[PDB]
Structure formats: structure tokens, C-alpha cells
From a paper:
[name] ([name]), a putative membrane transporter in the synaptic vesicles (SVs), has been identified as a target of LEV and BRV. [name] also serves as a receptor for [name] ([name]), which is the most toxic protein and has paradoxically emerged as a potent reagent for therapeutic and cosmetic applications. SV2 family proteins belong to the major facilitator superfamily (MFS) with 12 predicted transmembrane helices. In addition to the transmembrane domain (TMD) core, a cytosolic N-terminal region and a large fourth luminal domain (LD4) are present.
Purified HCA2 was mixed with purified [name] to form a complex, and then LEV was added. We used cryo-EM single-particle reconstruction to determine the structure of the [name]–HCA2–LEV complex. We successfully reconstructed a cryo-EM map of the [name]–HCA2–LEV complex with a nominal resolution of 2.88 Å. The quality of the cryo-EM map is sufficient for modeling the [name] and HCA2, except that the peripheral region of the HCA2 shows poor density. An unambiguous density, assigned as LEV, was observed at the base of the central cavity. Substrate-binding sites are typically located at the base of the central cavity of MFS transporters. Therefore, LEV is likely to occupy the binding pocket of an unidentified [name] substrate. A narrow pathway is formed from bound LEV to the extracellular space, indicating that [name] adopts an outward-open conformation (intravesicular-facing conformation). The γ-lactam ring of LEV creates a π–π stacking interaction with Trp300 on TM5 and Trp666 on TM10. The carboxyl and amide groups of the butanamide moiety in LEV form hydrogen bonds with the Asp670 side chain.
Author numbering:
A (entry chain B): 876 to 1295
B (entry chain A): 137 to 403, 418 to 742
Amino acid sequence: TSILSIVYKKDDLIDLSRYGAKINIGDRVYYDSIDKNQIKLINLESSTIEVILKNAIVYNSMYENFSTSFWIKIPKYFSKINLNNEYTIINCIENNSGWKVSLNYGEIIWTLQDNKQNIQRVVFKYSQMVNISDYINRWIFVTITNNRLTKSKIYINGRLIDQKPISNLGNIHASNKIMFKLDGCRDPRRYIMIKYFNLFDKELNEKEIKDLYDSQSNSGILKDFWGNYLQYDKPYYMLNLFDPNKYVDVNNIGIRGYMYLKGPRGSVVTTNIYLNSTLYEGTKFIIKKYASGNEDNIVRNNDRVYINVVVKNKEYRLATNASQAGVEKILSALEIPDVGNLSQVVVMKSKDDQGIRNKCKMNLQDNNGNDIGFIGFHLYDNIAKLVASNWYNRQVGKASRTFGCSWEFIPVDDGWGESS
Amino acid sequence: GEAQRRKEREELAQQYEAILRECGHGRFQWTLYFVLGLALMADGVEVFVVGFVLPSAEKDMCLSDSNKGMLGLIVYLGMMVGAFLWGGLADRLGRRQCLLISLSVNSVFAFFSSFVQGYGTFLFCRLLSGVGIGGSIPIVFSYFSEFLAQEKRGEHLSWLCMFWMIGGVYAAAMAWAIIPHYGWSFQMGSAYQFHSWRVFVLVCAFPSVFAIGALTTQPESPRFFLENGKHDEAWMVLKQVHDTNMRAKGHPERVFSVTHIKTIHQEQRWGVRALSLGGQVWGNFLSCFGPEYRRITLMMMGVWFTMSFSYYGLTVWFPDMIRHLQAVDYASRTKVFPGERVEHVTFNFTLENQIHRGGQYFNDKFIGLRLKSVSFEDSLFEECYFEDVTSSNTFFRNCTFINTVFYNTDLFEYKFVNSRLINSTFLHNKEGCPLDVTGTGEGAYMVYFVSFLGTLAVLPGNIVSALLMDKIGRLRMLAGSSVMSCVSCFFLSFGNSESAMIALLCLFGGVSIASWNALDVLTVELYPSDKRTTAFGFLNALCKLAAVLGISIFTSFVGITKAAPILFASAALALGSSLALKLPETRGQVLQ
Ligand SMILES: *[C@@H]1O[C@H](CO[C@@H]2O[C@@H](C)[C@@H](O)[C@@H](O)[C@@H]2O)[C@@H](O[C@@H]2O[C@H](CO)[C@@H](O)[C@H](O)[C@H]2NC(C)=O)[C@H](O)[C@H]1NC(C)=O
Ligand SMILES: *[C@@H]1O[C@H](CO)[C@@H](O)[C@H](O)[C@H]1NC(C)=O
Ligand SMILES: *[C@@H]1O[C@H](CO)[C@@H](O)[C@H](O)[C@H]1NC(C)=O
Ligand SMILES: CC[C@@H](C(N)=O)N1CCCC1=O
């Protein structure tokens, strides 16, 4: 049911579908080292991806429903130059007729234009004043459905954001060639990322789109704050989803010193461009592989690893005393040789028992494979102290709302632009 | 019917005078004088507390405007409610009973407010304390008067106004001796902090407790017993007075000759009792506005209202204007530096009262600097770095920040007025109030000194009024003092320096006190013994309401002109004096 499916291969891009669409790529198109299947497009002329379909699959009907899907990453807009700068990213428009996706300040737009130059637009809007954003500089699954008889709809990560009737529109033509380049951007240093572009000749429903989202989500592999692959031997800042205005911090070194959530988080401001909350506050959490036999640096689910703590540019280890008072017992950072037999083994957990994708959670386990439990925070005398507990596991067993068993990894990225 | 009641009341008044003349003046009267003086010193103290603690409480409880102004005028709304309520209740329950209950309420809620952390809670506590201390002046004057013979009533009642002065002197001295020690940071509970102004509040509560202690050892006034049909214990109280007096004199052998006393003939449960009390008090109130007392009561309303309005207006106005003049001098001394360009260099310094304009600082780091009333205008900071910065009354208006970092600074978002920040980060912001809270330092000593001088100015008038009240008369003294107050009000313009305001404050305070004395004596003397506390307390409540209105009005006009306060004060006092000359003469009469 798929007509175009651009997928990475050995130093090239191919089409999974049985149509053999011609592909040509510019000399300035980049690829991520770890996840090469993601494509980076900079604001230049040579940064071009041309893919040409066949004449038998060119959209030239008037009752033909069709859908598209892709993953997109849009960095932060830093200055006023990006305001009111609607710039195109994908065109299938010839003779002023076709379909086009474009980006504006906090906006992603689908545009259809028939032979009569009638323009229909669907928009997705995300703010930039928020403390922590779910869309800025983070991967987004965008899919668009077009039913010529009822409506055209937008789905962001499988949920409905906007719909507009298109019954008024007449015959819509399409270009034989389809476009990947930043067109109409005044900003000389604005780039995007795009991957997993798929086209279907029918209107997809909620169920199929949710299935596609889950399939392409890579639920079996851990993801960071920016939606990329989690890697070992790299410093990550730490965020608690339920209490995101505090950061991991230390006070004293060793067992007698406790790691806690200190706040509040600071701010980055640009006077009516963005007023986000600082994400580079606190102490880094490096991940060290222990028993994962995989050669690659990618962290997978159920992996058993170790976690370094960077305090005054010195690397310590997570451990807690297994034998102490209560289940919500205090974790600590220790000098790397003096761990002894303290519980240090941590299991990475991304998807649940049923396989439904959720955020990163770490489960402290001992040498004997006994679950100390999920890592989180609990309040002791008004201090949010870090503790590993099986209480989270108990609520998971009871299908209750766990409180604090979810962590988020934030590496330093160029798309955020914060000053360390 | 009415004639019979009038005859009975007159007979009781005449015989009561006779019994008091027999008992005589001596130790009993002086003992009661000291006790009731403490009760009045408490009310003297209570009117200074919030004004002395507001400079510290504004920082300690994050007090905005429309909150400082209210806390100021709260001791007066509470006194307004309390005066009426306890004055009305004192004629059905007794003077000493109601005095104990009101003083106890005052003491409790002052103690509570000493520890309260919030603002609304502090408002409520300080309102109830005002309610409690509201009923002090009416009960006290009406209570002491019922033990004095007509020979020297004005002289002996006027001495009772020394104590209110003493209360203010106490307040000022304790504020001077306690508040200046800002270091005291007693810690009991991490979330709470105990400063020196709270200690001041506690020590201000003390006088009221001492008042209750003293009062418990005095007897209810015999007159109240006689009106309410209770004959035996009125007899016993009069016997006690006679016994104490004569034993102190040196003749502990003579006998109380009075055997029978004329007494006014008397003609769900909780709710019924409350309704009955309310009905009786309402009756006493309206009987105060009866045919026999309607002219007197309206002249009394006029005199009380006009005097309170003028006095409170000017009393709040003089410190206001002194602060205004200080401000003007400070603003005159301000230094200006228009334009300066700075390259890589470290800046530590402390600047006070400065304006830097058109600055251009490029990659400058600001470590460990204190700003007091320093404004940066039309400046450009680029790759700057602010660390360990504490600022009072500091603003950045029309400034542009580029790639600057504010680390460990209390530069909140209200100190950047119409600024433009680009790629700027705020890290580890210091704890402070969301809005400007201003700052008061070394200038509190002079505030305490000024208060002290106000009270001391009051002293000569008290002495002279007490000595001449019976020789001259209440109407003459009231008039002669209100007129001089009006003249003093006219002389206000011949003052624009701080020293001038201090001298003028002293003059006005020294002049108005005799008028206030005379109006206290007159108001006691002019009402029957079954309505004295009710009437006195309704007039005192009116006094407090006038205080609220005059404080508001006269503080509204500070720094605007010196014509509005002079005109308002002079007009009010002239009308007060005019109305006072139309009141009936009460000297050389039995207390009826
Ligand atoms: C605001 O900052 C961004 C990111 O730059 C980072 O953050 C700054 C506060 C400062 O610490 C820089 O050294 C950091 O690199 C700027 O956007 C980037 O600018 C750099 C130039 O150094 C350029 O190489 C990147 O391509 C830019 N990225 C994008 C997506 O444009 C931005 O220029 C700053 N804002 C303004 C108004 O200049
Ligand atoms: C602070 O620095 C200034 C110059 O920036 C210097 O004159 C001064 O001596 C310093 N103070 C101390 C205590 O060193
Ligand atoms: C500062 O403010 C004035 C108006 O308030 C404006 O004209 C001026 O351009 C500003 N300063 C600079 C250097 O831009
Ligand atoms: C106790 C005295 C009291 C009064 N009612 O006379 N005073 C004196 C100055 C202002 C005031 O209310």
C-alpha cells in the first residue's frame, strides 16, 4: 500500500516500494553517524534531494484520497529574523498545482492547491515560551491524510491536531518529481532533519497511523531528550518529568553525601523569541556498559549497565547500601574503586511489559539479580532525595500512576544553543 | 412617670455625692489612678507598633503597597469597632468586667501577632488587638469618675492623661532599644524566621498584661451597682473606699455612717441572653439620642470628630513630610555619568545614588558589587557577566543585553524596564520578593527620636491643664486650646526643613493636649451614669473613624502642597471650637 519509501542503504538512499523512483542527492547533504537513516538539510542550493516517481503513480485525479508520513526535527528559532518567514521544505507543485509542506515560526503547514489555484491549508502550532517543550528541537512524527470527499487532517505523533474540509477543491495535479530542500528561508544558518518519508494512495485511519507510529518509533531502543539514540561514554543532563524545575545535584562525596533535586531551574530569554528553562543545569550522568555484548554504542532495552556521575569534572559511581531502613533508601555517588558489593547494576527500561513505549527508567538491581527497584525521588524533610524503590514496581503491577519513576536524558545539542 | 424617675435619679446623684464627700480623697483614688493608668498606657503604646515595625515587616513578609497602607489604618478600624462594642457592653455588664475582657482580648491577639508569619493573618490579629484596646479610654474615664467628688473632678481626671503620654515614650524607647539590632535571627522551624521587630511587638504587648493584673485587685464602681438594683455590694465598695482612705489618713477607728442607699428600682438560653443584651444596648444607644440629650450629643459629635480629624491628619502628616524632604535632598545629591565605553576588565565596587547613561560595556564581569539606587539607562551589555550582585532600587531601563549571564544575582524581571535581552541566561537567582520592597537603614533612630519629642511636647500641656481645669473650666480650656491649635496650623508653612518640622510637631502636640483633656472631662461629666460608657464609646468610635479618614486624606497630600493640610486642619478645628462653645457648663455640679 506504500508507493514511496525513502530508506537508507549502503552509502545511498533507495525506495522500499516496487516502483523504482529515481533518487539524486546533492553534495552537501549530511547524515548522522549513529542513525544515518536521518537526513540533514541545510539552507543552501546544493542541499537537494530529488526523487522522481513513475507516470503511472502521479497524482492527477480529483476523487483520489492520499496520505503522507515522515519524521521531522526543527531546531530552535533564536532571533527575530525567523518571524514571518514562511519557508518551504517539500514541494510537489507544478503549474501552481500540487501539495507542499512548509515551516514557519512554531508552525508546520500542509498546503493543497488545485488547478483553479484554490489554496487549502492545515497548520500545526507549537509555542516557544514554554519552560520545557515537547516539540522544539525534538523529533516529531508528522502524518497528513487527505480525503477528497470529507476533510484533510493532520496527526502529530498519532493524535489529531487540526482538520479542514476540502470538498470545495476541484482537480489537484502533482509534480512528476518531489522535492527536498529549504526554499524561501532568509535565515542562512537554518537547517532541518527529516527521515522515513512514506506515501500512501489512501486515507489512513487512527488505528493504522498509530500502528505506523509504534512500528517506526523503535520502542526497543532508548531515546534521549532530543529523540536520538542513547549512547555510552557521553555526558547526559538529567530531568525528572514529574518535577522538571529541579536538577540532579550533589552535596557531599561518598555514602554520607546524598544526591537530590535542587531548584529552581534558571532561564534562557530573547525577549519575545523564546523564554525556555535551562536544561544544562546540574550534574551529568554518563552511562557505562557492563554486560551488553552489542558492539555498537547504541543502548537497547533490558541492558545492564553502570552510570557515572560527573562532579567537578570527576567521574563517580551510582551505588546505595542495600541493607538500610525502608524501601525508599538513599542512593549515593562514590569513588569508582570503593564500590565493593554495593548495588550498582542498573537495567535500562524503555517499553513496558506489554511493549508499549514509554520514557527512560532505570531499575537498580543487586549482584544477586534482586530488584532494589526503579530510581526516582522522595521527599525527606522538604528535600527531594534520590531513592531506588520497588513502590514504583508495585504501582506498575497494580496499573497505578507511578510518581517519579521516569527520567529523561538531555545531551548538549547545537539545536538548543544554551551557554554551558 | 418621667418626673418620678428624674426625682429618683437626682436623689441618688445627690446622696452619692454626699457619701463620696464623706469617704474623701486619698489612697484609694491614687491606687485606682495608677491601675487605670496602666490600662491607658496600653492604648498609648498600641498606636505606634505597626508604624515602628513596617520598615522591617515590608521586607520580612513581602509587603506591597495597598498592604502597607492598610496595616497602617488597621489599629484604627479595630479600635472603632471595639470602642463602640465595649462601651455599649460596659453599661449592662459593668466597667471592670468589660475592661478585663477587652484588655484580655488585646493582650491575646498582640501575643498572637508577635509570631504570625503571613500578612492576612497579621492583619486579622492586629485588627482584633485594636478591637480589644478600643474600649479602654471610654471605660477608664467613666470608671475613674464614679469615685470622685465634685470638689476636684476635672483636676483628678486630667491627671489620668499623663499615662497615655507615658505609653508613647515607652513605645519609642523600646523601638530604639530593640529594632536596630537586625542581626537577631532566632530560628525556630526552617520555614519561619524570628526577627527583632517581633520582639518589639511582644514587649509592646506587655503593658496590657500588667493592666489586667492590676485591675483584678480593684472593685466594681458602686454607681453601676446602684443603677442596676444591686444595693449590698455598692454599700460594701463604698465602705471599702472609706476604710482604705481613713486608714491611710491615720484615723483607722471611725465608722462608715451610711446605712441605706437609694437604689434605682428595677422593673437557646444563650441566644435569648444575647438578644436581651443587644436590645438593652440598642435602647441605651437611642436613649443617648433622646429629647433630653440630643443637642448635647450633636455638639459632642462635632467636637470629637473635628478634633480627631485634625489631630490624626497632622500627626500622620509631619513624619510623611520629613521623609519627603529627606527624599528630595537625596535625589538632589544624585550623580550622573552620561556615556562611558568599557573593555575587558573586572568591576567590584559599591555605588549609591548614581545614574549611568549611554554606557557601552563589552565583555565585562561584575563580581561582588552592591547597588543602592543606581540606574543604568540606554546601556549596552555584550558578553557581560554578573555574579554575586545585590541591588536595592536598581533598574535597567532601555538597556540591551547580548550573550550575558546573570549568575547568583537578585536582578529579577521587574528591574529590567523596557529592556531587550538576547541569548541571555539567568542562573541561580537569589531569593527575593516578586516586586520592589524598598530599603530602610540608620534613619530609624531619628524616627524614634521624633516620636519621643512629640510625647514630651505633650507633657507641659498635661501639667497646666490638670492644674487649671477646675480653676478655669472645661469649655474655656477646650476653646482656648482648640483656637491655639488652629493658629499653630496656620504657622505650618513657615517650615520646609526637617528641623522646622520637628519644632512644629512639638508645638502642635504641646498645644492640642489641653483641648483633648478638657473634651475627656466634659464628655464624662455630661452623660448620666447609665449611659456614660455607651455614649463615650460611641463618640470614641467616631473619633477612630475620623482618624482613618484624616490619615488617608493628609497622607494623600504629602509632597503636593502645604495648603491642603493647613486649610483642612484649620477649618476642622475652628468648627470644633465653635461647636464646643455651645456645650453646657458642668463645673461645680454633682456627677449626674
Ligand atoms: C544565540 O545563540 C545561538 C546559539 O549560539 C550558542 O549560544 C550563544 C548564547 C553563544 O554561547 C554561542 O557561542 C553558542 O554557540 C546562535 O545561533 C548559532 O550561532 C552560531 C554562531 O556562533 C552559528 O554557528 C550557528 O549556526 C547558529 N545556529 C542557528 C540555528 O542559527 C544565535 O546566533 C544567537 N542569537 C543571535 C541573535 O545572534
Ligand atoms: C576589588 O577590585 C578592585 C578593582 O577591580 C580593586 O581596586 C580592589 O582592591 C579589589 N578589592 C580587594 C579587597 O582586593
Ligand atoms: C534608548 O531609548 C531611546 C528612547 O527611549 C531610543 O531613541 C534610543 O535608540 C535608545 N538607545 C539606543 C542606543 O538605541
Ligand atoms: C487618653 C487620651 C486620648 C483622649 N481621648 O483624650 N487622646 C489624647 C491625644 C489623642 C487621644 O486620643
